Nucleic acid binder design. Structure first.
Ligand SMILES: [Zn+2]
Length: 240
DNA sequence: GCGTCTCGAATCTGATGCGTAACTTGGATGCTTCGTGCGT
């Protein structure tokens, strides 16, 4: 895939809705997924309504929405893709911690989109940049766009295991929060501050926010075993 | 019209108890769409 809207016609294969206008002016980017809207394509003027609180993430002021985004803005699409991973084969659910560990330790090779919501249901279909290479995974968490490097996650897990190797009571070296909301998120704990070497402390302080978020779901006393997430595109298509 | 001597001294100089108790020891929110109907 190339664009967030490309997930529709490639893994959902949903035909465009009826009654959509046809573009007849100089091409302009979509207001959601930044896809160009060329002459002869199907679009619709923006009618997001007063309850749309994602104006800051709009690609442009074209006020035009391509049919793929019009599909992606349906309630069944927003709810189904709350904790989704959209790859070529299908849409997978990464809600469970084991799924997150598998994704951030053994990512799929193909381009994919990573979905995650910080509340009941949020606009995430059209805000996630594509992950071209598995070594640089871009994850959209609520209003935060994260960059996760699997090698950094593996190195941090190795550091935590080596620091907790001797002590019988397991204790995390770095303070992390699943919601990425705590005031101490990403800061070293007392055990990390006074039981780790200078190189390990410098590495743990110099990780990206996305890596902290991922370790908040992976790094624990009993590391979850990675497992393949289930196929979810069937459920979303049936509910639509 | 003073007048001067003497113009202190020893010793005690604190003891004893009490010298905390019970209860609170958080709570709530931070999402949009969709259908149906008002409605100004
Ligand atoms: Zn679009």
């Amino acid at each position: 895939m190339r664009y967030p809207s490309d997930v529709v016609d490639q893994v959902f294969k949903l035909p465009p809705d009826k009654g959509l206008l046809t573009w007849d002016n100089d091409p302009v980017a979509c207001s959601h997924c930044a896809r160009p809207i060329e002459k002869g394509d199907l679009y619709s003027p923006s009618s997001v309504g007063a309850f749309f609180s994602d104006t800051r993430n709009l690609a442009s002021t074209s006020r035009s929405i391509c049919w793929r985004c019009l599909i992606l803005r349906k309630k069944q699409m927003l709810n189904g893709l709350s904790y989704a991973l959209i790859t070529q084969d299908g849409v997978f659910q990464i809600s469970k911690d084991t799924n997150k560990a598998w994704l951030f330790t053994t990512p799929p090779p193909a381009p994919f989109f990573v979905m995650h919501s910080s509340s009941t249901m949020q606009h995430l279909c059209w805000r996630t940049p594509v992950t071209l290479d598995n070594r640089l995974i871009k994850v959209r968490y609520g209003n935060n766009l994260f960059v996760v490097r699997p090698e950094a996650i593996r190195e941090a897990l190795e550091i935590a295991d080596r620091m907790n190797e001797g002590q019988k009571k397991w204790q995390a070296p770095i303070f992390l929060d699943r919601k990425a909301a705590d005031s101490g998120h990403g800061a070293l704990t007392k055990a990390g501050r006074e039981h780790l070497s200078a190189a390990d402390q410098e590495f743990l302080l110099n990780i990206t926010p996305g890596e902290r978020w991922a370790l908040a779901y992976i790094m624990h006393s009993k590391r979850p075993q990675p497992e393949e997430p289930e196929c979810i595109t069937s459920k979303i298509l049936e509910k639509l």
